[PDB]
């Protein structure tokens, strides 16, 4: 994952430079000193990309060259057991509906419809997560 | 010596009477263990709770319009003219220990009774538990639902209240008095004269504590006797045929689980009677014709009738020197609703042509037209129920009241059609999913084929597999199919120690091996019984 | 300016342009081959069409084998 | 159904073989946490703008932070992170019950942190400062209470994962699920360290 | 593997030889699966007629009538499209 | 062995990955899309009643027309219960062939009727309409097994 990590490393370098230069040029040469909104946003997007790039670099050093990363890699090299990709499931729509019922409850300030949307969201997230772990019914 | 006492009492019972054979038949009677078959039990248990709480309430309720100044304990209503019914309802709420709780759990039990009757009706209608046999059972059940609706209507109207009295003035008075040929005659004969006649609440009290509940009890007895002696139908399954009942016997398992379910249902009802406020009559001042609120809704079971009243578009006819108010429209609508509900099994048999003795239910997906019609009817009922609530819907969810009314008006012909089409196609697509599972096996994780980059989901066949990879497709048998290896013998043996700590490996191995042996034994017993029946 | 003129313009110029462009483009020979005339020789390669109507055991090709042609009659005609 | 067409002992397995390949669930969780960092960045921007526009006395006169109750809770959150990492080690091993113990104590300490934050909220509200009451109160409550909502979400994730481990046998799939839940908890405690250093020490 | 196949013999009794077929509704034999198209066409036409008729009422409003007109128009358009397509054999 | 004149290559598996130039099509059938749709509708559900795979072969079936009809029927996926109507306008010939399972179901009686419909339509000058008419007539004649 060398290139995958290096992309985020480059983004981190650029965003750190942008945050530093913005902070300096806003502490001096601005009407009211540091802006404190753009500065924080730039610092923490630098943090975003830094976290992602650091994890990607850790993984790149932890893993040997994958076929995907390896030029001149035959299809047979990667041929094998791909993992579990979830088949058909109707839990995502229920999660979306529950979160929409919480969102409308927040918009129209209805604590009762917030409380229920959140319950709804917990139930549907539990269903989605347990979908492929609910053992056979034991009677 | 409890064993000796039990043996002696059994001998005494079998000597005085001879109930051995009948009792053994009752104990050995087999009941299917499907969850959807407990929906009627919910209604039965809620009815029992209703009876028990209603006796307590009758011990303290005084039905009368005799005007009285409160002079009670509730300060916000002191010196205000009120009927004795309202005064004694307030006394139950305040000056009787646990009276508020008892009346609240009574009203919550009424709401659960209506809701569970509705859910049971949905179950039976969608699973076809009414055709050829049990059609009369469906008929009497429809009568029971209507009686429950009007029983709750008279119940929450029993304590003369602003809200409930306004509901009475609307429905019982206006609708009754608008009926063309005999409307005023029915009104005067029910109310002993004009609307506020001094006998309305006593008459409703009689109807609500003795007459209608007596009929409900008789019809529930008939219903349960019919279910008992016309053995309960069951979903298609491994060993389940039209001439057998696969399940559990009454004595060891069914009886205990039904009693436990009764306990849990009454616990839910008590918890809700405590924690949730129902019908705060003290907030709802005494009935006065000049006073009214903005809510003015009936309980959720009569909410569809009220919504019909609201939505119907003010069509009145004036024959020669007469008037035909809009109340007759809703009255005829209710009549049609009840007639169709009562006569559906006969309508369905006339339409389709099936008079065969059906003991195996059919999954709602397997009957697209009937599930579509039921979905359409439920959509219409929900539309009417929310139309009745359009006032609060408009208030809270910021939508103009006229907009809500006209949304209901247009939807009650648009939404039923949309839901019919969607439900029909949804049922057919559920059938298609079942067929795809039958012919391809269950779905699993993807695998990349060795030589080439083909991706294959690596299914798992549910039946015998052909010489090559693809399996021999099975034939649909009217029973649900496992669409997740999750629910099959795949990744289902966690360490059986505990939540925090393990158990010894010997104990864990013994337990898991015994469980696997029990599963093998059960599946083999079902398979052998199925083979014996069909061979 | 000339409310009626502006309304007519906004309602008509799109229609006039649509008509002109449809005449230009929709009236062009498509890529679909022209219908085969009976008089003309049959130049296209043989075309065998099948219904895919009934159920065919299992979708898997293997196991089908070749039981045989098992002919079951015949017919003939000359237009 | 001879044995199985899919030669796997788990209906659900790791989404890719993690020994040679990256764990997709971990990668997705890390990316999403990096996004939640930007959400908290927006909250931090709000707080810092309010701080800048304050007229010297950043915490207004009515408000007074209670380090006595803010230091124990952050220490407990750090301890929760350590116990969560121990549970991660258990999950990396096959130690189902060790993972369960570690995650249960982590959940208990996170609940203690939430209750301590609620107690400090009650005390602060009693002593004047309130969301509508002041800009400091509002920005502080938005930041710390959104973090508290994230902590509650982490608690829900903990209990939900524990239920999953109860209902299905431990596999690399559940080990990875525990790992990503721990990633979320570590992100939550890190943003709490940032919020503590900002609200209380830096002020 | 821990699942047993199901054998079902439900009592049957129209014989389904006319109407819908298994290729269109896989469980045609297992329950009521065909609603005559005339029923749905007439139902749509009557729903449109009811929507139009609700225009006549005691409402000074006009957006209500326009909404009724639009919904009735789309209902009639759907019914007409379906009827025309089935008349021509599901073409265009 | 040779793939299509340009742009079509044999892949790692059996499937041949083929291409067509951007402006042109792939089917190249010399019939209107609507009439092809009508014929497909016939073969698909107007034959569902017959429960026998109905097939149409417009290609040229030369030499012994009967025998070439037999083997092009053999090429049908399920010749056991199949009814192949072959028309060669280069020879102005119709040949109908049937599978062994398609016997005594009214197919033999319908054979002259279908061929007559096809011939009438062809002499009128409509290959596709004749094919549709023949398919309809034969499907009506044939009863499900
Ligand atoms: C118009 C189109 C837009 C609609 C917008 C509304 C979207 C939400 C409604 C659809 C959600 C349900 C669904 O998709 O159908 C699944 C289900 C089919 O499942 P299946 O996989 O094919 O079952 C095969 C076997 O039974 C065996 O399959 P199985 O192994 O998967 O098990 C059966 C499956 C089947 O389970 C269910 O059917 C549950 C039905 C949930 C309905 C939720 C209603 C939300 C209100 C929407 C309003 C419209 O499994 C279960 O989950 C059983 C446990 C029950 C869980 C109940 C969870 C309640 C969650 C509440 C969260 C809060 C959300 C509030 C928003 O469809 C139905 O049968 C129900 C009809 C659709 C409901 C209409 C609601 C009115
Ligand atoms: C207040 C009370 C506490 C609230 C939380 C209760 C929910 C936890 C239990 C749910 C799981 C379950 O029942 O299965 C485990 C197990 C059932 O085993 P089984 O039915 O023999 O076999 C299930 C098969 O695996 C079949 O597996 P499956 O995949 O076909 O579906 C399994 C199961 C669950 O599958 C799911 O769909 C998972 C999502 C539901 C979990 C909800 C957790 C979060 C709920 C928060 C608030 C709830 C609203 O299906 C259900 O939805 C069961 C009904 C529970 C609905 C919960 C409320 C909605 O039940 C238990 O361990 C105890 C359950 C005791 C009955 C209480 C359920 C209803 C009470 C909650 C509603 C109260 C509303 C007032 C607030
Ligand atoms: C009220 C609502 C609350 C719920 C109550 C409803 C419960 C209904 C469940 C039915 C269970 C039942 O009756 O089982 C009894 C059952 C009677 O039937 P069986 O024994 O099977 O007789 C052969 C069949 O009945 C022969 O029948 P089959 O299988 O050939 O089919 C014929 C069937 C045709 O099917 C029907 O049409 C049945 C439906 C009846 C329609 C409506 C009648 C019920 C109306 C109830 C109204 C209640 C108010 O006709 C009937 O059997 C009608 C029987 C009517 C009894 C209904 C009981 C209520 O056996 C027993 O009598 C066992 C209990 C033994 C009691 C003695 C215990 C010791 C004695 C101690 C005394 C004092 C001790 C001091 C020292
Ligand atoms: C302040 C204040 C007044 C508070 C109190 C509120 C108030 C007024 C009233 C509520 C208070 C009370 C008394 C609540 C409890 C109600 C009650 C009796 C609950 C019983 C549940 C319980 C305690 C279970 C303990 C657990 C246990 C060991 C259970 C197994 C042994 C038991 C109890 C078995 C009971 C079996 C049972 C439910 C029999 C019901 C008898 C009836 C009416 C019908 C039987 C019956 C049933 C149940 C069917 O399902 C059925 C289905 C299809 C065809 C026919 C039938 C049929 O005939
Ligand atoms: C059960 C619900 C599902 C229903 C299904 C049926 C779907 C069909 C809906 C039909 C909609 C009809 C809308 C028209 C109605 C109408 O005619 O009223 C108008 C108001 O127009 C509007 O907004 C139109 C809004 C239409 C939006 C419909 C949204 C559909 C939602 C409800 C679907 C979600 C359903 C959720 C399901 C939940 C599931 C529960 C399990 C004007 O009132 P007014 O306000 O007085 O306007 C005055 C001026 O006119 C005048 O100039 C000016 O002077 C002023 O006086 C001004 O006030
Ligand atoms: C919320 C929703 C509203 C509430 C909905 C609940 C009410 C009941 C629901 C639907 C009823 C209408 C059903 C559809 C009726 C079908 C009509 C037809 O064309 O007849 C064909 C049939 C098949 O025969 P087949 O040999 O299979 O041939 C296949 C031919 N294609 O013929 C027959 O046997 C029957 C002919 C006569 C049937 C008369 C049924 C109605 C009786 C009066 C009751 C009032 C009805 C109220 C309607 C709402
Ligand atoms: C795609 C369509 C796109 C259509 C988009 C148009 C949107 C513009 C609507 C409102 C703008 C604000 C004006 C607000 C005031 C209204 C204008 C006015 O005054 O117009 C004269 C009279 C009423 O006179 P009035 O003095 O209001 O008093 C009366 C009683 N006292 O109405 C008329 O004839 C002319 C009709 C005016 C509006 C009717 C629009 C309703 C719904 C259209 C179709 C819905 C389709 C549903 C499909 C399923
Ligand atoms: C007071 C109202 C009701 C009570 C106490 C009640 C009770 C029951 C019970 C306990 C069962 C057996 C268990 C089950 O099938 O779930 C049952 C079955 C049945 N009910 Fe009711 N129900 C009521 C309302 C209704 C309504 C409104 C209808 C319509 C109806 C029709 C039926 C039918 C047809 C059956 C037979 C189902 C079968 O044999 O599997 N019932 N009822
Ligand atoms: C059969 C089904 C029944 C239903 C659906 C039902 C429903 C109701 C409802 C909703 C109320 C309103 C309670 C309140 O507003 O606080 C009520 C009141 C009452 N019910 Fe029933 N009930 C039923 C049976 C009974 C029975 C069997 C009795 C007598 C044993 C009874 C006696 C009473 C009394 C005395 C009141 C007045 C309580 C008050 O005014 O607060 N009910 N009923």
Curated annotation (Swiss-Prot), chain F:
Keywords: Isopeptide bond, Ubl conjugation. There is a cross-link at residue 103 (Isoglutamyl lysine isopeptide (Lys-Gln) (interchain with Q-Cter in protein Pup)). It comes from the Bacteria. InterPro entries: DUF5130. This is Uncharacterized protein MSMEG_4692/MSMEI_4575. It comes from Mycolicibacterium smegmatis (strain ATCC 700084 / mc(2)155) (Mycobacterium smegmatis).
């Amino acid at each position: 994952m060398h290139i995958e990590a290096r992309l985020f490393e480059i983004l981190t370098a650029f965003f750190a430079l942008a945050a530093v230069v913005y902070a300096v040029l806003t502490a001096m040469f601005a009407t009211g000193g540091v802006e404190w909104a753009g500065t924080t946003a730039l610092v923490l997007t630098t943090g975003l990309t830094l976290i992602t790039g650091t994890f990607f670099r850790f993984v790149a050093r932890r893993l040997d060259t994958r076929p995907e990363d390896y030029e001149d890699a035959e299809i047979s090299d990667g041929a094998g057991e791909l993992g579990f990709f979830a088949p058909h499931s109707w839990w995502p729509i229920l999660i979306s509906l529950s979160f929409s019922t919480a969102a409308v409850g927040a918009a129209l300030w209805l604590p009762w419809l917030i409380a229920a949307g959140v319950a709804f969201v917990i139930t549907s997230v539990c269903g989605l997560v347990f979908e492929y772990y609910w053992g056979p019914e034991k009677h | 010596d409890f064993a000796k006492l039990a043996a002696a009492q059994g001998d005494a019972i079998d000597s005085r009477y001879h109930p051995s054979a009948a009792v053994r038949r009752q104990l050995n009677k087999v009941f299917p263990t499907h969850w959807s078959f407990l929906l009627g039990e919910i209604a039965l248990y809620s009815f029992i709770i209703l009876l028990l709480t209603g006796v307590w309430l009758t011990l303290f309720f005084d039905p009368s319009m005799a005007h009285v100044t409160y002079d009670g304990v509730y300060q916000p209503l002191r010196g205000v003219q009120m009927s004795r019914a309202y005064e004694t309802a307030l006394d139950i709420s305040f000056e009787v220990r646990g009276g508020l709780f008892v009346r609240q759990v009574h009203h919550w039990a009424a709401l659960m009774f209506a809701a569970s009757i509705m859910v049971h009706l949905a179950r039976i209608f969608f699973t076809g538990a009414f055709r050829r046999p049990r059609e009369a059972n469906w008929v009497i059940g429809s009568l029971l639902l209507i009686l429950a609706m009007f029983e709750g209507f008279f119940g929450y109207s029993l304590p003369d209240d602003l809200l409930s009295g306004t509901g009475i003035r609307a429905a019982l008075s206006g609708i009754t008095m608008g009926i063309p040929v005999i409307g005023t005659w029915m009104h005067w004969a029910l109310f002993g004269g004009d609307f506020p006649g001094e006998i309305l609440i006593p008459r409703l009290y009689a109807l609500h504590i003795l007459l209608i509940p007596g009929i409900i009890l008789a019809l529930i007895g008939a219903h349960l006797a019919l279910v008992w002696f016309q053995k309960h139908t069951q979903f298609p399954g491994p060993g389940r045929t039209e001439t057998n009942v696969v399940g559990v016997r009454v004595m060891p398992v069914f009886a205990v689980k039904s009693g436990a379910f009764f306990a849990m249902i009454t616990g839910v009802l008590g918890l809700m009677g405590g924690l949730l406020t129902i019908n705060p009559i003290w907030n709802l001042g005494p009935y006065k014709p000049s006073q009214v609120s903005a809510g003015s809704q009936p309980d959720f079971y009569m909410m569809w009738t009220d919504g019909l009243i609201r939505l119907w578009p003010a069509w009145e006819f004036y024959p020669f020197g007469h008037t035909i108010p809009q109340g007759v429209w809703v009255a005829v609508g209710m009549g049609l609703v009840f007639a169709l509900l009562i006569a559906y099994p006969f309508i369905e048999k006339k339409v389709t042509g099936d008079d065969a003795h059906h003991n195996l239910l059919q999954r709602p997906r397997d009957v697209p037209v009937r599930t579509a019609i039921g979905s359409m009817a439920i959509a219409l009922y929900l539309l009417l129920t929310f139309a009745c609530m359009n006032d609060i819907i408009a208030l809270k969810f910021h939508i103009s009241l006229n907009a809500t009314t006209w949304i209901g008006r247009i939807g009650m012909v648009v939404l039923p059609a949309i839901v019919y089409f969607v439900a029909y196609r949804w049922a057919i697509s559920l059938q298609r999913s079942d067929r795809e599972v039958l012919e391809h096996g269950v779905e699993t994780g993807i695998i990349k084929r060795l030589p080439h980059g083909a991706y294959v989901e690596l299914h798992q066949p549910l039946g015998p597999v052909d010489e090559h990879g693809h399996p021999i497709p099975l034939e649909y048998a009217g029973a649900p199919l496992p669409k997740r290896m999750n629910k099959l013998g795949s990744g289902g043996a966690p360490g059986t120690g505990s939540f925090l700590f393990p158990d010894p490996a010997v104990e864990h191995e013994a337990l898991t091996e015994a469980a696997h042996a029990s599963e093998h034994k059960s599946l083999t017993a079902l398979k052998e019984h199925q083979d014996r029946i069909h061979g | 300016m000339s409310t009626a003129l502006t309304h007519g313009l906004i309602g008509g110029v799109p229609l006039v342009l649509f008509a002109v462009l449809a005449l230009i483009f929709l009236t062009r020979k498509g890529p679909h081959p022209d219908t085969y005339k009976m008089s003309d020789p049959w130049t296209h390669a043989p075309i065998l069409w099948a219904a895919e109507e009934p159920r065919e055991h299992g979708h898997g090709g293997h196991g089908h084998d070749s039981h045989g042609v098992v002919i079951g009659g015949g017919a003939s005609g000359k237009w | 159904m001879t044995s199985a067409v899919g030669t796997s002992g788990t209906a659900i397995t790791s989404r890719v073989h993690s020994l040679n390949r990256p764990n997709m669930v971990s990668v997705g969780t890390i990316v999403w946490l990096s996004s939640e960092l930007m959400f908290f960045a927006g909250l931090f921007a709000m707080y810092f703008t309010a701080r800048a526009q304050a007229g010297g006395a950043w915490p207004p006169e009515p408000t007074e932070l209670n380090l006595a109750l803010a230091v124990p809770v952050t220490l407990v959150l750090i301890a929760s992170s350590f116990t969560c990492q121990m549970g991660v080690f258990a999950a990396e091993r096959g130690d189902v019950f060790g993972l369960r113990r570690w995650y249960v104590i982590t959940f208990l300490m996170g609940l203690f942190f939430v209750l301590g934050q609620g107690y400090e909220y009650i005390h602060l509200v009693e002593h004047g400062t309130t969301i509508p009451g002041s800009a400091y109160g509002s920005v502080f409550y938005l930041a710390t209470g959104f973090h508290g909502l994230h902590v509650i979400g982490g608690l829900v994730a903990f209990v939900l994962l524990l239920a999953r481990t109860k209902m299905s046998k431990f596999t690399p799939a559940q080990a990875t699920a525990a790992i990503v839940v721990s990633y979320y908890w570590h992100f939550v405690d890190i943003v709490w360290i940032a919020l503590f250093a900002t609200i209380y020490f830096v002020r | 593997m821990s699942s047993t196949q199901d054998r079902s013999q439900l009592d049957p009794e129209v014989e389904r030889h006319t109407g819908v077929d298994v290729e269109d509704v896989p469980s045609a034999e297992w329950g009521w699966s065909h609603m005559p198209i005339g029923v749905m066409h007439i139902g749509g036409l009557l729903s449109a007629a009811f929507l139009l008729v609700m225009m006549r009422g005691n409402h000074v409003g006009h957006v209500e009538d326009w909404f009724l007109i639009g919904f009735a128009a789309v209902i009639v358009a759907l019914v007409g499209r379906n009827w025309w397509l089935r008349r021509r054999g599901w073409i265009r | 062995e040779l793939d299509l004149p340009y742009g079509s290559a044999l892949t790692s598996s059996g499937r041949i990955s083929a291409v067509t130039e951007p402006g042109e099509l792939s089917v190249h059938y010399p019939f209107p899309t609507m009439d092809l749709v009508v014929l497909d509708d016939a073969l698909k559900y107007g034959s569902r009643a017959a429960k026998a795979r109905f097939a149409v072969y417009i290609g040229p079936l030369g030499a012994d027309t009967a025998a070439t009809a037999r083997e092009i029927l053999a090429n049908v996926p399920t010749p056991e219960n199949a009814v192949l109507l072959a028309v060669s306008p280069d020879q102005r010939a119709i040949e109908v062939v049937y599978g062994a399972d398609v016997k005594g179901r009214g197919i033999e009686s319908a054979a002259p009727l279908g061929v007559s419909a096809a011939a009438a339509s062809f002499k009128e000058g409509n290959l596709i309409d004749g094919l549709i008419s023949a398919v309809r007539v034969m499907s009506a004649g044939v009863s499900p097994a």
